[PDB]
Design a protein around this motif. Structure first.
Motif, mmCIF file in Angstrom:
data_model
loop_
_atom_site.group_PDB
_atom_site.id
_atom_site.type_symbol
_atom_site.label_atom_id
_atom_site.label_comp_id
_atom_site.label_asym_id
_atom_site.label_seq_id
_atom_site.Cartn_x
_atom_site.Cartn_y
_atom_site.Cartn_z
ATOM 1 N N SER A 47 99.787 -22.874 83.731
ATOM 2 C CA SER A 47 99.440 -24.252 83.898
ATOM 3 C C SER A 47 100.162 -25.123 83.030
ATOM 4 O O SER A 47 99.820 -26.490 83.302
ATOM 5 N N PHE A 48 100.974 -24.538 82.126
ATOM 6 C CA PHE A 48 101.624 -25.431 81.176
ATOM 7 C C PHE A 48 103.055 -25.890 81.361
ATOM 8 O O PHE A 48 103.780 -26.554 80.814
ATOM 9 N N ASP A 108 101.245 -32.626 71.329
ATOM 10 C CA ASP A 108 100.598 -31.877 72.579
ATOM 11 C C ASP A 108 101.721 -30.817 73.132
ATOM 12 O O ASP A 108 101.654 -29.922 73.528
ATOM 13 N N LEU A 153 102.546 -27.741 71.381
ATOM 14 C CA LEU A 153 101.527 -26.464 71.526
ATOM 15 C C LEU A 153 101.652 -26.168 72.945
ATOM 16 O O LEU A 153 101.208 -25.031 73.288
ATOM 17 N N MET A 154 101.894 -26.823 73.813
ATOM 18 C CA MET A 154 102.307 -26.301 75.192
ATOM 19 C C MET A 154 103.205 -25.348 75.372
ATOM 20 O O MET A 154 103.469 -24.537 75.983
#
Lengths: 106, 107
Positions: free
Chosen positions: A21-22, A88, A91-92
């Motif tokens: 998903s990332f 962000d 962290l992905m």
């Protein structure tokens, strides 16, 4: 020899990272202009995304899978160098790095 | 009194270290993520850092005040987003945990 490892990375890892998903900020080359970052390609001497792995595996460019991992890490390290703790995007990356590292099977 | 410690040392401790908790720890920058009308839809935004500070700074007078602040966070996300948006499967998976770690709370 050292080449059974190399299509594990193609048919398992790369394809497991792609459907994560990332993985979409790392699929294609960073569009530096539309993202308001006028330095990413003067800062990063080794631009690496996921699609470029896909093709060096399709192309069989990697001799010894050692060379291949190096680029997977280059893609996360490229990220960490450029960005900063907490972002962000980082962290992905730290969660893709995590799944990638979990595929230490063969 | 007693329970507010529990929300520090169990619920918040475990939620903070979940794989999905990071998009709820700090204020959402809708400017960057490109979320239209975000802080117009969300009257009362909630992050987990705010629940951290309020428990550290002992601002809550009752665990009720705290538990609602959690639900404000989850519900805030359900409003703005679709069902099936990845951010919501994350939010839901957390509330499932939040509710487990609450069913073991003292008196």
């Amino acid at each position: 020899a050292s080449t059974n490892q190399l299509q594990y990375l193609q048919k398992v890892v790369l394809k497991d990272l792609w459907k994560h998903s990332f993985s979409w900020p790392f699929q294609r080359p960073v569009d530096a202009v539309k993202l308001q970052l006028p330095d990413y390609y003067t800062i990063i001497k080794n631009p690496m995304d996921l699609n470029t792995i896909k093709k060096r595996l399709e192309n069989k460019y990697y001799a010894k899978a050692s060379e291949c991992i190096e680029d997977f890490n280059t893609m996360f390290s490229n990220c960490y160098l450029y960005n900063k703790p907490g972002d962000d995007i980082v962290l992905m990356a730290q969660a893709l790095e995590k799944l990638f590292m979990q595929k230490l099977s063969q």
